[PDB]
């Protein structure tokens, strides 16, 4: 049966891999949250494996097992970082729940009636660490997620580690793909169970896992239809409106057709998250703190001669641009939806 | 009651006016087709009446009773025209029914499955006249409507008449409104009962009635919502998809909210049809042949400083432009609807 072949081709992230030295499973399926859609496994390859090069060239996700991209950072943990990350401020988001939905603060104006679900607080690294310990100590249910662009202020030893990244490998990758400049390295330190909801990014991303384990669910740009992004002017622009924990199939019917690419990344894995691909990211339940550094590159420039029919991501670019232009042209983001309905109701169904 | 005041403020085209010399009603209400919406009467004013100037300046419809715009043309009838209109070809549309739906022939390609409802045939004026007489003679049910831009070929006396138009009046009007150039004069000769379905034009129009009587139903550009124009790339671009004789309220629910401005124009009336205003035009039942000449002017140019919020017609311009750009950008008109639904389903409802 083709359903039969399909039911097992939804292997998720495969059987948990065994750590070297017979250290038993690093995780087990019970630490993954339960969702309603099938997924297939993102392949885990060697960086010298040509198939992995073929996937990156084609802008498909792959987990590279052996880049050494952030090899010096694998000794990172809270104690080390607090002694050497320096006295700069770090952006930390606080949430009552396990889904951190983010917001573009600038867009906070036009929509008055959005109410934030997680607040952001600036603090020195040592305060963040203490604030974690506190919550831990008092068995509290609060949740914190630190996300900060690594900046000049970082201490001596963190710079030394940084220089030890495998710039040769990723530099060549930037060249080979015609990508733009590296815009930033985002440091993410998460509490176990933390969820970043499905969203896509307007940059290419090499996602370098450092401590703990993150389950990554990806969807191709061609499943825009099933994922229902917030309006472009909305503070949650680029995130799915679908609550993966309780999907409203009445509002979002095509979410019943979504199929995900999935993987678990641990210390030393690099996950290529192609530009425009949706990703949902959860730090495994009872896995401890997680640490990731990503590398965000501006995407390749638009080609001289456009080849038709358009790829899916180009259509996302177009739709985004249509909403932006109507926003400016009407004098008000809030008339975009009304104009758009006038335009299709009874004309394009 | 405000419903009471409303039920009589839907006066339609008023009581039929009595012709000079006590010649009884020129028409009676029984010669108007029956429709489902209320209408109010377009005012009939003198060209020296400042209110009429106020309406034109504000781009609202008005019937000017005394322009003499086409005074020399009032002697026109079929016999005169056939003796002097010259031997050029005239475009004539043929229909099985009384609604002439037109088509942009160039757009006939992209949509294969549209089938024309009325065909066009080129013929010399004298053939058109004979073809009318024939249908008349044989009691046939066929319908013909001649519509031809008046061109160089017209005979000596038709040019003399043309020079006798009140260019002073309309020239000043063109100036006073900053309009563009006069692009054309369309001659329309209709069989009694002929209907031109609701549509809007991208030019300002002084509609100069010559022979017979035409009922004109207008709707403001702000009732775009209720009138459901064909997609821009569709051969019937700019016409309503609503069949006024049998409106499908399931497909076009807001047609139940449409309110029309209405009038009957007879020999010597000029109806200012403002750019973007919808108009539905019927030659009265058993009224005989009708003759109109219109004057189409390019509209005023876009203003240096845009004043917000936008007027309704500007929003029609915008929507039109959005559909055109997606058409080009996607490589195919036929993907415009699909992209547009992807964009709103579950995002702007």
């Amino acid at each position: 049966m083709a359903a039969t072949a399909a039911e097992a081709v939804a292997s998720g992230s495969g059987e948990p891999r065994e750590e070297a030295g017979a250290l038993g499973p690093a995780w087990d399926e019970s630490q993954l949250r339960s969702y309603s859609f099938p997924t297939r496994p993102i392949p885990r390859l060697s960086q010298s494996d040509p198939r992995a090069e073929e996937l990156i060239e084609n802008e498909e996700p792959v987990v590279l097992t052996d880049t050494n991209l952030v090899y010096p950072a694998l000794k990172w943990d809270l104690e080390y970082l607090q002694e050497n990350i320096g006295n700069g401020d770090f952006s930390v988001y606080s949430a009552s729940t396990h889904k951190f939905l983010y917001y573009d603060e600038k867009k906070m104006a036009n929509f008055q009636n959005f109410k934030p679900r997680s607040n952001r607080e600036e603090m020195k690294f040592h305060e963040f660490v203490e604030k974690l310990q506190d919550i831990q100590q008092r068995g509290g249910e609060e949740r914190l997620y630190l996300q900060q662009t690594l900046n000049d202020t970082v201490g001596r030893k963190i710079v030394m580690d940084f220089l030890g990244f495998n710039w040769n490998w990723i530099n060549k990758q930037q060249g080979k793909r015609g990508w733009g400049q590296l815009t930033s390295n985002l440091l993410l330190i998460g509490m176990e169970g933390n969820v970043t909801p499905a969203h896509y990014d307007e940059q290419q991303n090499f996602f370098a896992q450092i401590k703990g384990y993150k389950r990554c669910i990806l969807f191709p740009p061609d499943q825009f239809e099933c994922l229902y992004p917030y309006p472009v002017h909305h503070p949650c622009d680029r995130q799915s409106q679908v609550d993966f924990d309780n999907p409203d199939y009445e509002r979002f019917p095509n979410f019943q057709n979504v199929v995900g690419y999935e993987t678990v990344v641990g210390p030393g894995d690099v996950l290529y998250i192609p530009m425009y691909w949706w990703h949902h990211i959860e730090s495994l339940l009872n896995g401890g703190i997680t640490i990731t550094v990503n590398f965000w590159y501006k995407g390749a420039p638009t080609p001289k001669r456009i080849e038709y029919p358009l790829k899916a991501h180009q259509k996302v670019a177009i739709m985004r641009n249509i909403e932006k232009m109507l926003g400016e042209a009407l004098g008000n983001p809030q008339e975009v939806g009304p104009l758009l309905n006038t335009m299709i109701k009874g004309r394009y169904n | 009651m405000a419903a009471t005041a409303a039920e009589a403020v839907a006066s339609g085209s008023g009581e039929p006016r009595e012709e000079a010399g006590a010649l009884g009603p020129a028409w009676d209400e029984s010669q108007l087709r029956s429709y489902s919406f209320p209408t109010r009467p377009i005012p009939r004013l003198s060209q020296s009446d400042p209110r009429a100037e106020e309406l034109i300046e504000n781009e609202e419809p008005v019937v000017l009773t005394d322009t003499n715009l086409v005074y020399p043309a009032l002697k026109w009838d079929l016999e005169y025209l056939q003796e002097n209109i010259g031997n050029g070809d005239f475009s004539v549309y043929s229909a099985s029914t009384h609604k002439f739906l037109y088509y942009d022939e160039k757009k006939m390609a992209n949509f294969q499955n549209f089938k024309p409802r009325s065909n066009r045939e080129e013929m010399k004026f004298h053939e058109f006249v004979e073809k009318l007489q024939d249908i008349q003679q044989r009691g046939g049910e066929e319908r013909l409507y001649l519509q031809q831009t008046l061109n160089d070929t017209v005979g000596r006396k038709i040019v003399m008449d043309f020079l006798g138009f009140n260019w002073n009046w309309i020239n000043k009007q063109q100036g006073k409104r900053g309009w563009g150039q006069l692009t054309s004069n369309l001659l329309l000769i209709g069989m009694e009962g002929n209907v031109t379905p609701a549509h809007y034009d991208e030019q300002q129009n002084f509609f100069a009635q010559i022979k017979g009587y035409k009922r004109c139903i207008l709707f403001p550009p702000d009732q775009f919502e209720c009138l459901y124009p064909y997609p821009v790339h569709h051969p019937c671009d700019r016409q309503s998809q609503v069949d006024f004789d049998n409106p499908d309220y399931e497909r076009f629910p807001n047609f139940q909210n449409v309110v029309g401005y209405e009038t009957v124009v007879g020999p010597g009336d000029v109806l200012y049809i403002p750019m973007y205003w919808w108009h539905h035009i019927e030659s009265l039942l058993n009224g005989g042949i009708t003759i109109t000449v219109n004057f189409w002017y390019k509209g005023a140019p876009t203003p240096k400083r845009i004043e917000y919020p936008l007027k309704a017609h500007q929003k029609v311009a915008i929507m039109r432009n959005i559909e055109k750009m997606l058409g080009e950008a996607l490589g195919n008109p036929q993907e415009v609807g699909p992209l547009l639904n992807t964009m709103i389903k579950g995002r702007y409802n």
Partner: peptide
Amino acid sequence: EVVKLLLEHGADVXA
């Protein structure tokens, strides 16, 4: 020109 206008993309990331 039109096509390339609508194909240009911003570079918005995370928050």
